[PDB]
Design a protein around this nucleic acid. Structure first.
Length: 104
DNA sequence: GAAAAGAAGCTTTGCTTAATAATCCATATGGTTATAATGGGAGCTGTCACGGATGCAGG
């Protein structure tokens, strides 16, 4: 899960901003009060510190009240589900028959 | 519960078309012409009433 996140980010993160990053990429332009709501274990300035890291890294930014990742963090998520497909859903990553097509 | 049937999701593929090599052609530029060749032309012609600025002149 966050193994693929922090591993896919080359360990630039910790688990707090990992699951917060799952929350931000999970619903587009959500409020940080919902982030603190689904993270009751973390403090208000702990969540705001982790958003200070993602803003500090420039991944998650605002749109007025908006909160969303950029495309590079999106590539980190898609690599995370890629390795999650390599190790957790192996037959989901498959391929069917391919047409040639035409023969002389 | 089977079985045709139609979509999701891959591919090709004949056609197009935009990028780019090739070529040719307008265009500029300059040169170069060795007998001699010596002051233009429409100007309107039938306003006109005022008016102010020159303009000239004698006391």
């Amino acid at each position: 899960k966050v193994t693929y996140i922090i591993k896919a980010s080359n360990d630039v993160l910790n688990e707090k901003t990992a699951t917060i990053l799952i929350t931000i990429a999970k619903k587009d332009f959500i409020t940080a009060a919902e982030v603190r709501e689904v993270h009751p274990d973390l403090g208000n300035a702990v969540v705001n510190s982790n958003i200070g890291v993602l803003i500090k890294k420039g991944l998650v930014e605002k749109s007025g009240d908006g909160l969303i990742i950029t495309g590079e963090a999106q590539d980190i998520i898609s690599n995370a589900a890629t390795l999650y497909a390599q190790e957790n859903a192996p037959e989901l990553l498959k391929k069917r028959a391919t047409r040639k097509a035409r023969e002389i």
